[PDB]
Structures are given as structure tokens and as C-alpha cells.
Design a protein around this ligand. Sequence first.
Ligand SMILES: NC(=[NH2+])NCCC[C@H](N)C(=O)O
Ligand code: NA
Length: 238
Amino acid sequence: ALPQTVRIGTDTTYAPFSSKDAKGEFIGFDIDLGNEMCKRMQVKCTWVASDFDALIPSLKAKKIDAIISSLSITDKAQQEIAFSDKLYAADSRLIAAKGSPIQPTLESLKGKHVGVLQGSTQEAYANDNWRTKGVDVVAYANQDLIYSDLTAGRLDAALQDEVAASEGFLKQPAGKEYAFAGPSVKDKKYFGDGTGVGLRKDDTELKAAFDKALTELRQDGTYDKMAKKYFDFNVYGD
Ligand SMILES: NC(=[NH2+])NCCC[C@H](N)C(=O)O
Ligand code: NA
């Protein structure tokens, strides 16, 4: 027994998953997935923009009903909220200036300024592994601020979801001087297993509804066709 309107929170500074076009309309793979699921659920949905670190608290306060915002399914997150089945895979990777020697290692990063999104898995990773050991880890309200501070030369590097960095910055005008610094950083504990719809633990029926719709759009090929708009690779992963 779902609500008539499902309110979905997202942070719109994470192309190609969630961002705003020139008119301020919400666009991206997340938006397409959410709208497609809502359609199949036969509910109305309202998109709600907010800073990433506000999403889980807004959810718990019932100011939104769901989060679709490249939110990784982690053990930690599941202490607070529930998730749909996996929407797509999301590894983390560092970016730095082209021809930077930088690596995602303590040895490389000590004394350098590294940007992370506040409230993200990447902030947790960097705070635990890098900030404690003397890396200047800087946390930001949103990812656009990070990209800006990076191109302004205030940051040496930045850690975020690999596909967001690549499609949303590196392959975009602002990022032509930049590249990945080292390989993706795999850490089961911190980065979880792909992303999913974030939900209140007790909203069992909403989760089942989302899961049902997600299954169905994967089954009839809609998932792959939508994904093809953004990616020429297997975004879903395993
Ligand atoms: N729309 C966004 N800004 N998403 C950031 C997601 C970062 C990371 N995957 C996390 O779950 O913490
Ligand atoms: Na599947």
C-alpha cells in the first residue's frame, strides 16, 4: 500500500547520474531509473534536490521517501536505512592533473590536498586512511565545488565514483587537463556493492515495489537501452 506521491531525494552534482540541465531540470541515469520505476509502480514521484550529506537525515525524518543518488549499498549505511536491489556498480577512483605522479597511496598523498564529498563513502575512506595519517583531506558540500577547487588548483586530487568523474568531468570541457591518478580503489568495507534506492527500514512495501519495477525494467531490456544513452560499457557490473 504505497503513497500516492513518492518523494525522491537526490544530489544533482553528480553527472551522468544526477545533475541539472540548462533549464534546471533533473537529468541523468538515476533520474531515468527513478522515473521508469515510478511509472511501473504506478505512483507519482517528486524529485527533491539536496546536498548529499542531507539525504539520509531527510529520509529518516520522512522529508523524502527515497534516495536515488548513486548511494552505495554498504554495511555501514544499512545500519541506518534499507536498500533496493542493485541499480548499478560504483567503484571509486582518484583524479589529478594530467602527468601528475599522484597515486591513491599514503606515500603519494601525504601533505597533498584531496577533495571528497561530505557524507560520502569516499569521505569515510579518506578520513580513516588518509586524514588520520596527515593527508590534507577536504570535505565539500557538493561535487561541483570539488571540481571547481580542483581546476582552480586548490586541490591536488579528488576521490569520487569512477564513472561520475569520467563521464561527468574528465570527458567534459572542465576536465580536459585532468586524468585518473592510479587504478580504482577497491575496498569492500567502505564502498559497498553497487548503488541502490535508499529507503526507511520499515518501508517494506515500498522496497518490494521498487525491487519489482527494477526487475521488470531489467527483464524487458529497458535498463540497457537507457544505459546506452550514457555508457558504452557494462554499468551494472556483476
Ligand atoms: N549524487 C551524489 N552526489 N552521489 C554521491 C555518491 C557517493 C558514494 N557512492 C556514496 O554512496 O557515498
Ligand atoms: Na539483473
